[PDB]
Design a protein around this ligand. Structure first.
Ligand SMILES: Nc1ncnc2c1ncn2[C@@H]1O[C@H](COP(=O)(O)OP(=O)(O)O)[C@@H](O)[C@H]1O
Ligand code: ALF
Ligand SMILES: [Mg+2]
Ligand SMILES: [Zn+2]
Length: 661
RNA sequence: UGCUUCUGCU
RNA sequence: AGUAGUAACA
């Protein structure tokens, strides 16, 4: 049965008041919400609840661990990206008493032009927003709630009650009391909160490592980078190799070289980014991980004419064997990994006692840590059974994990079939593993919310939380600051809870008005930008070889995301460059075909979309330079281009191609 | 693998 | 204004 503090925290929600339930990590906010939902549905006819989450895995978790109990009396349905294609959301939701989904599923339905796929906010009488601290800025939670505010302020009746759940509203980067209070008020405004409802041990250790005394591998990479920069014959080139600033500056240089079609500079900049990437890997995991980064990059090359590429290939080849030999030398081991080994050795003896998550920033790092573990003699024999856990992010450096793949790892971790995960931020919030008693945060730079949340995955009574970071580093400073900011957040929330009602209400009104006005202004500005140029006056150039390949007027959008070229002669500019792509996820109206490349230079451009009975090429914006009358620009997003793009019409497209045959 | 939110960084 | 990552959607 519910704890006293659970009953106390939901008392406002039971009375119908919009609220945020502020309870610590692991305190049982979900069960409290289920109780609210049961009483809500019992207390009226025709009620309907939406439960919004921010991570695919939490749909299944909340259903199977908490919300399924409602099925004694009510119909409960769950939807995530994997199951999206199976039903029209409108039909599914309307046939349910409770629907649990990732928030973007609901947002898509709110925006839909299809009768059967569409819902309105007024189709729900209660919205439960899990991890509601994400309801800010342009996060999907806030896109939904901004619409709610627009409707509320316009006088709409029968908007749903709001129940937000969070352990950590945060301070939003504010370090003053006044700033932190303002942030809390902003959260409250965004969620249309009437009351923040709250209640009326673990140990933490800093496992600090030192910089490697001797890093010949890194030293050699830096010496190659200097040689490459000399070859570029340019003044004021950055010298700060192996930093995030260098990474930014070298990519910005690549962008400028694309925009001005300086091939030599661009190619050199491309390679330097890879060397910098290797330095960053070298600092995070093993030398051999960094080596493999570079080796793979240069292996996938073939013999070419381009004198620049030949210089760069020769340069790597001259250093390759030395780099690999160094990478196999235990003398130059990463102290971060030495420290991690110490932690695991201490806590996973005797074998199978501990149940741990090691959080790392990137998917690639998680995979490298698993590989490192499997290859560390000092850990083999301690019956550590480990696996990687990531979300469904994807890049050429690392694929993601499907909902199903994630679920397999989580289920085996829950009762100790696996006893250690190497995880990204996919599992920093929400994941409930009662037996988890160790969290290590490996060299992370995050806000205080992520710190609190990740720590909170260790549910067990006698849990430990380890910060594994470089001594004297910004990472250590930020951890310490974040600890203080948690305290500041608490003080700010208390102050808001104690505010006089009249003052609170007026402040919320002022903030909600500001939010809905600011949105209108932003939308007007965005529209003005996208109407600057006639699409006929915009030309796309291949980013690699600078050949012109189409005009803006050749492009249409599918599902407001996928930019297809509908010109029947575009086929003479691109080549199909792969066998058929397969995705685990199925979509309603299309599936990928093959990858496509520039016919001149083989630069990757995008992929085919098999949309119903036609095949069209999708272009990724990052593979082009966009040329207008005013400038040449390499865009990383379509959303900021300076010309309008019409929606694809399948009917019109079919009619048009039939006339040509 | 198309998309662009968030977080870090400048 | 970018950049890097990440996650979500498709
Ligand atoms: N009243 C209760 N009695 C026993 N276990 C409970 C109670 N309420 C919640 N739990 C359990 O507490 C754990 C943490 O709950 P959860 O909802 O994941 O925490 P959070 O507040 O971070 O969402 C879960 O395993 C849940 O089933
Ligand atoms: F605060 Al939680 F799962 F919602 F730790
Ligand atoms: Mg939770
Ligand atoms: Zn080309």
């Amino acid at each position: 049965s519910l704890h006293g503090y659970q009953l106390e925290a939901v008392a406002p929600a039971l009375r119908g008041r919009n609220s945020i339930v502020w309870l610590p990590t692991g305190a049982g906010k979900t069960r409290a919400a289920v109780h609210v939902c049961r009483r809500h549905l019992e207390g009226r006819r025709g009620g309907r609840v939406a439960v919004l989450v921010n991570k695919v895995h939490l749909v299944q978790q909340h259903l199977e661990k908490e919300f399924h109990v409602l099925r004694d009396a009510f119909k409960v349905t769950a939807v995530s990206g994997d199951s999206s294609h199976k039903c029209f959301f409108g039909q599914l939701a309307k046939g349910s008493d409770v629907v649990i989904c990732t928030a973007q599923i609901l947002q898509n339905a709110l925006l839909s032009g299809e009768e059967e796929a569409r819902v309105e906010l007024t189709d729900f009488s209660l919205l439960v927003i899990d991890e509601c601290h994400h309801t800010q800025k342009e996060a999907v939670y806030n896109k939904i709630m901004l619409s709610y505010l627009q409707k509320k302020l316009s006088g709409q009746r029968d908007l749903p009650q709001i129940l937000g759940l969070t352990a950590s509203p945060g301070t939003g980067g504010e370090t003053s009391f006044e700033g932190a209070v303002e942030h809390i008020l902003q959260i409250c405004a965004n969620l249309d909160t009437e009351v923040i409802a709250s209640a009326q041990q673990p140990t933490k250790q800093y496992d600090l490592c030192q910089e490697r005394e001797q890093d010949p591998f890194g030293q050699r990479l830096k010496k190659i980078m200097a040689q490459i920069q000399e070859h570029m014959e340019m003044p004021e080139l950055p010298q700060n190799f192996g930093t995030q600033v260098y990474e930014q500056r070298i990519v910005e240089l690549e962008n400028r070289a694309a925009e001005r079609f300086c091939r030599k500079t661009r190619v050199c900049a491309l390679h330097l980014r890879r060397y910098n990437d290797a330095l960053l890997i070298n600092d995070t995991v093993r030398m051999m991980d960094a080596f493999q980064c570079l080796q793979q990059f240069y292996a996938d090359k073939r013999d070419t004419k381009d004198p620049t590429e030949r210089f760069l290939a020769t340069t790597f080849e001259e250093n390759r064997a030395t780099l690999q030999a160094l990478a196999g030398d235990q003398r130059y081991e990463n102290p971060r990994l030495s420290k991690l080994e110490e932690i695991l050795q201490e806590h996973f003896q005797p074998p199978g006692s501990s149940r741990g998550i090691v959080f790392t920033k990137t998917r690639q790092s998680a995979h490298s840590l698993l590989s490192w573990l499997q290859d560390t003699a000092g850990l083999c024999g301690q019956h550590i059974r480990a696996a990687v856990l990531t979300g469904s992010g994807h890049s050429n450096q690392a694929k993601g994990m499907t909902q199903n793949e994630q679920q397999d790892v989580i289920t085996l971790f829950r009762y100790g079939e696996l006893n250690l995960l190497f995880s990204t931020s996919v599992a920093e919030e929400g994941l409930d593993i009662p037996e988890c008693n160790i969290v290590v945060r490996y060299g992370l730079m995050t806000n205080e919310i992520a710190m609190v949340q990740a720590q909170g995955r260790a549910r067990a009574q006698n849990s430990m939380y380890s910060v594994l970071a470089k001594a004297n580093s910004r990472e250590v400073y930020r951890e310490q600051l974040n600890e203080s900011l948690v305290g500041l957040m608490e003080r700010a929330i208390r102050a808001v809870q104690a505010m006089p009602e009249r003052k609170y209400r007026l402040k919320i009104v002022e903030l909600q008005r500001n939010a809905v006005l600011s949105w209108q202004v932003k939308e007007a500005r965005s529209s003005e930008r996208r109407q600057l140029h006639d699409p006929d006056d915009v030309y796309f150039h291949c980013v690699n070889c600078n050949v012109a390949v189409c005009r803006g007027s050749d492009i249409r959008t599918v599902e407001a995301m996928h930019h297809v070229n509908i010109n029947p002669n575009f086929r003479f500019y691109y080549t199909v460059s792969s066998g058929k792509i397969h995705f685990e996820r199925t979509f309603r109206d299309w599936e990928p075909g093959c990858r496509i490349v520039c016919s001149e230079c083989r630069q990757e451009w995008g992929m085919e979309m098999i949309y119903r009975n036609v095949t069209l090429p999708i272009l990724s914006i990052k593979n082009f330079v966009v040329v207008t009358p005013d400038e040449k620009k390499k865009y990383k997003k379509w959303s900021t281009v300076t010309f309008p793009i019409e929606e694809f019409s399948y009917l019109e497209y079919c009619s048009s191609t039939q006339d040509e045959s």
